[PDB]
């Protein structure tokens, strides 16, 4: 069987940069290589086949080159909709995928738009109380979120989920949830979500008061 | 236009059988072979083999000889993947295609039962006041298995929707979804999140109340 070594496994590049991925086969595959784009929740999309032929509808920013055992795939100028994992595929003899390349797109700093939400009546009647904070469209990814109850930091009961990189503007978004018992939630008044990269010194703060 | 539509996500126990469908349209079905591809959680794509759509003859990759069966219903331009005597290692998303591909079918092999989600509205209560726009959300809590699909206002507000991937703890998944609309539209107009959990055949609908 023909093995395929794809490099790099992860690639970081700025918007507008040219990016290049390579695949090397364990033997001559005589230009029978294809390149796929894969976004989570979607099927693979064939971009290039026979080393360098573009599929219909694929932007001209995509290209490929190579011969024998050594192949490359390039994006002329990286754009937000290119966020995906990329795979090569040999089809000289049976099929073999390369290991894949994940993209990390670099762009300008962005501060999040922050929204805070009290527990719903529906959840409170079941004994639980989740306070939710959305941080939409920030960059870089390593944002920090602090929770305060009555002005004191709380760390237990916080769950955080980051999105994949945004296919519109290459930002990230993240959801932070502070989950309490209903009894604990009704034992305090002020609830506060604070966001910092510590680029901007002053945290973006959003709060509500139960009264 | 070419489209491949696969059947929905599945929960199966070890030792059971699953059959996944792949409905092709927009092209001549018997002109192109149909390939099957496995993606286990957090791994890359692995080729499973193909089936000749003219003869029905399948060819399996080495790692998929034994418990895997490709078949066809050519009159319905549909391909099938059957996996017998299911293993935990079969938990994966499976894709059919060649040049164009189906959306994937997520399979979870587990002894746990299905649990539909609880859906809690996320709306500004008495603290966050306003702006040029208002952000709303739905918290989708305590469901199993994956996946769920949150639809806002039947698809009207499909733009400006952010999906936050599920986290697992104590055997159950929690995810959330945010939408942002002009303040002149909410609460003036109705906003609803519709949460589909296909493995339990359940849809949970929540109206976002001020």
């Amino acid at each position: 069987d023909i093995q395929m070594t794809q490099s790099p496994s992860s690639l970081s590049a700025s918007l507008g940069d040219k990016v290049t991925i390579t695949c090397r086969a364990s033997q001559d595959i005589n230009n029978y290589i294809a390149w796929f784009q894969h976004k989570p929740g979607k099927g693979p999309r064939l971009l290039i086949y026979y080393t360098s032929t573009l599929q219909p509808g694929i932007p001209s920013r995509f290209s490929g080159s190579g011969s024998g055992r050594d192949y490359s795939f390039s994006i002329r100028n990286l754009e937000p909709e290119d966020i995906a994992t990329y795979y090569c595929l040999q089809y000289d003899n049976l099929r073999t995928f390369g290991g894949g390349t994940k993209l990390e797109i670099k762009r300008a700093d962005a501060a999040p738009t922050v929204s805070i939400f009290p527990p719903s009546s529906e959840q409170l009647t079941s004994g639980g109380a989740s306070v939710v904070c959305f941080l939409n469209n920030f960059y870089p990814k390593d944002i920090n979120v602090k929770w305060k109850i009555d002005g004191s930091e709380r760390q237990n009961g916080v769950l955080n989920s980051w999105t994949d990189q945004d296919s519109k503007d290459s930002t990230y978004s993240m959801s932070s949830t502070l989950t309490l018992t209903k009894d604990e939630y009704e034992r305090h008044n002020s609830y506060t979500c604070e966001a910092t990269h510590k680029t901007s010194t002053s945290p973006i703060v959003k709060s509500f008061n139960r009264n | 236009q070419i489209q491949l539509v696969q059947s929905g996500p599945e929960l199966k126990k070890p030792g059971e059988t699953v059959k996944i469908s792949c409905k092709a349209s927009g092209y001549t079905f018997t002109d192109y072979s149909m390939h099957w591809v496995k993606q286990a959680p957090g791994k890359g794509l692995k080729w499973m083999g193909w089936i000749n759509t003219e003869t029905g003859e399948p060819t399996y990759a080495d790692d998929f000889k034994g418990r895997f069966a490709f078949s066809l219903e050519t009159s319905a331009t549909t391909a099938y993947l059957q996996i017998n005597n299911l293993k935990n290692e079969d938990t994966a998303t499976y894709f059919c295609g060649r040049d164009y591909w189906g959306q994937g079918t997520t399979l979870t092999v587990s002894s746990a039962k299905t649990t539909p989600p609880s859906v809690y509205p996320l709306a500004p209560g008495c603290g966050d006041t306003t702006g040029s726009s208002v952000t709303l959300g739905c918290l989708v809590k305590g469901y199993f298995p994956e996946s769920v699909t949150v639809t806002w206002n039947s698809g009207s507000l499909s733009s400006s929707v952010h999906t936050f991937p599920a986290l697992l703890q104590s055997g159950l998944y929690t995810m959330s979804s945010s939408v942002t609309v002009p303040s002149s539209t909410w609460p003036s107009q109705t906003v609803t999140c519709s949460v589909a959990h296909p493995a339990s055949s359940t849809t949970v609908d929540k109206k976002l109340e001020p």
Partner: peptide, 8 residues
């Protein structure tokens, strides 16, 4: 050839 590309 070899069964890849051109669909569309």
């Amino acid at each position: 050839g070899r069964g890849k590309g051109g669909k569309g």
